[PDB]
Design a protein around this ligand. Structure first.
Ligand SMILES: [Mn+2]
Length: 664
């Protein structure tokens, strides 16, 4: 039922994706790469003392602090949701092979019994009302770009000046490019304006993944991660195979001379994609104003900052249901892209802009290196973008696409199973908009707090409450999917945006508190996704600019966890055993060094200004800016800190661009 076309790197269609420069040519050819990460300056992830430390600590913590999660997935007592074995990976060494991305998810969705469009007129009105509320009265803002981020296809530039030029030129030429695409002239739009081509597939480490200790054998077992081979990916699963990738790390001894202790595995690898920057810039210029609207007008549902900010909302609920979505990005439906585009056209959005947006969600994918001797293949034809990959991670509005799908999916679930008495309020577009506007502000008896695939669904006192309890019971039973749109279950150890919802004996939201996840502290400190990149001179361009700073925000982030002190003492004891040094003194030195280094980057900071004016969010973000891409937003960060990590295109250029896109 239609295999996607595939082109080797030697083909002209793949060659056209890479400009005539060293960086672009190296990106096209990059072979499978692996190696120990520099966890901290002068410390490799595979250092024998470090692995000895991880073995002792993971075993001790699991033993003394077993998971406290009830039958309904609610966390209580110690605030622990699983074992501590997730740290037992040889960081920088991936599972083999990584998956080939699916060119079409239509069969995947159909086989999972998920709908190929809105089920009812009510659902159609609600998805369309989400578009009308999110994209209406937007205000122009500067187009902010992450420092050191790549422009990907075709230039592969990491230079801010070049990126600003590309973005400004893209805002000037988006109209002409969109109009070419409306004529079916995709090759012309790409050749002239670099709008099109493909996503560039990079495989990112998920540094910690599930590991269990079999009591019968005393041997560790890593969670099997299913991967698709090339045949499966091009045929959307009609042909080829879906098999468990190998996480076995024994190979590292033979290949690299690295000692592999018992129960240490290769890391899980996830597909991540980088979009063609010239196509993303006009999308980002609309996406940022949309975020500003939803985080202000609909702050209740969408704007999440601190554990207390989340707590104030949840405490008012009679029932809180922490949901889980299976493989959100790959299941994300192309019919939603089409519905969104159709609704934007109805609202009066520039057709050329809608075409650019539509094209960004149908684009071919260039597969780099999933395994040794594999990859270097373009999936899909850039002359006529027609892929159904789901949601591409590097698309300019991915967070909004996932948020829109999921927010409506959860509301539909609440309507179907708990609140049929609210159906009469959704008769047409004006009434659907009024209802959704009220629901998103937290003014209804059914409520939610969400971000992409993470959410907590709420019920206050009223007619829907009884239904709310039946839905929770249906989720616990796990025999029937409560949604026609996505695969929904309950989260095993309910958490929202990193914070665990800690319940007491009553198991009620009113007396539950949000606490930091102690396991995430351990993941961040001992299993970072990236190395320190000590060879990258400009720290603001690194994946981890100032790692030492996270020590200063630790107490604020994790201090509320019941076992906080216990974990820090266990770390100290185990680090003494492994290195013959104080971990606390080691982190205090790193904190001092990074505080001093930070002042070189902040204009307002004198030669030794200190961290006094910085918030815990500022510190977590400076140590890990990836938190600014999934956890927080621009407004949550101090202005002088945001400038360290981002640079912008003037509001004058974006204001003119936005006026040309938006209705009258
Ligand atoms: Mn959650």
């Amino acid at each position: 039922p239609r295999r996607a076309p595939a082109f080797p790197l030697s083909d002209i269609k793949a060659q056209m994706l890479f400009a005539n420069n060293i960086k672009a040519q190296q990106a096209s050819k990059r072979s499978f790469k692996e190696g120990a990460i520099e966890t901290y300056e002068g410390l490799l992830s595979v250092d024998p003392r470090f692995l000895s430390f991880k073995n002792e600590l993971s075993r001790y913590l699991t033993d003394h602090f077993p998971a406290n999660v009830d039958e309904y997935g609610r966390v209580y007592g110690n605030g622990v949701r699983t074992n501590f074995f997730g740290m037992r990976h040889m960081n920088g060494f991936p599972m083999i092979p990584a998956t080939w991305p699916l060119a079409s998810n239509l069969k995947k969705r159909a086989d999972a019994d998920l709908a190929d469009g809105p089920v009812s007129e009510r659902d159609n009105l609600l998805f369309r009302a989400a578009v009308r509320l999110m994209f209406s009265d937007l205000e122009p803002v500067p187009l902010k770009i992450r420092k050191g981020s790549s422009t990907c296809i075709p230039y592969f530039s990491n230079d801010m000046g070049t990126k600003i030029e590309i973005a400004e030129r893209a805002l000037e030429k988006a109209e002409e490019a969109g109009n070419l695409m409306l004529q079916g002239k995709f090759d012309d739009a790409y050749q002239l304006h670099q709008m099109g081509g493909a996503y560039y597939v990079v495989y990112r480490a998920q540094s910690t993944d599930a590991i269990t200790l079999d009591p019968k054998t005393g041997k560790f077992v890593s969670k099997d991660r299913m991967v698709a081979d090339f045949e499966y990916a091009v045929t959307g699963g009609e042909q080829g195979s879906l098999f468990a990738a190998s996480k076995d790390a024994s190979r590292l001894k033979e290949q690299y001379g690295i000692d592999v202790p018992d129960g240490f595995f290769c890391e899980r690898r996830r597909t991540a994609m980088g979009g063609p920057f010239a196509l993303n810039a006009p999308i980002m210029a609309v996406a940022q104003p949309v975020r500003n609207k939803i985080y202000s007008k609909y702050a209740y549902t969408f704007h999440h900052t601190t554990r207390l900010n989340k707590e104030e909302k949840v405490k008012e609920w009679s029932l809180c249901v922490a949901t889980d979505v299976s493989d959100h990005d790959t299941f994300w439906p192309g019919w939603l892209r089409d519905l969104i585009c159709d609704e934007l056209l109805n609202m009066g959005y520039a057709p050329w802009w809608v075409k650019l947006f539509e094209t960004s969600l149908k684009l071919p994918v260039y597969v780099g290196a999933p395994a040794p001797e594999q990859g270097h293949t373009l999936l899909g034809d850039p002359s006529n973008p027609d892929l159904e990959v789901g949601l591409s991670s590097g698309q300019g509005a991915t967070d909004l696409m996932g948020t829109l799908l999921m927010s409506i999916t959860y509301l539909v679930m609440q309507l179907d199973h708990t609140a049929p008495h609210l159906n009469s309020r959704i008769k047409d577009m004006p009434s659907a908009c009024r209802f959704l506007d009220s629901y998103w502000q937290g003014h209804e008896e059914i409520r939610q707090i969400s971000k992409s695939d993470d959410a907590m669904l709420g019920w206050t006192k009223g007619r829907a409450l009884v239904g709310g309890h039946r839905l929770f019971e249906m989720l616990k039973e796990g025999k029937v999917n409560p949604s026609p749109y996505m695969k929904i279950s309950y989260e095993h150890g309910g958490a929202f945006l990193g914070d665990i919802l800690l319940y007491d004996s009553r198991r009620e939201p009113g007396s539950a508190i949000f606490v930091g996840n102690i396991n995430s502290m351990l993941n961040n400190q001992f299993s970072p996704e990236y190395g320190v990149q000590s060879g990258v001179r400009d720290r603001s361009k690194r994946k981890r600019p100032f790692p030492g700073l996270a020590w200063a925000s630790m107490k604020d982030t994790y201090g509320a966890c019941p076992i906080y002190s216990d974990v820090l003492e266990a770390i100290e004891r185990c680090w003494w055993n492994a290195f013959g040094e104080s971990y606390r003194a080691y982190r205090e030195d790193m904190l001092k060094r990074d505080t001093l280094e930070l002042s070189r980057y902040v204009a307002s900071m004198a030669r030794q200004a200190g961290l006094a004016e910085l918030t815990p969010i500022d510190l977590e973000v400076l140590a890990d800016p990836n938190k600014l891409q999934y956890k927080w937003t621009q407004a949550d960060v101090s202005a002088n800190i945001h400038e360290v990590l981002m640079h912008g295109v003037s509001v004058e250029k974006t204001e003119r661009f936005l006026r040309s896109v938006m209705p009258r």
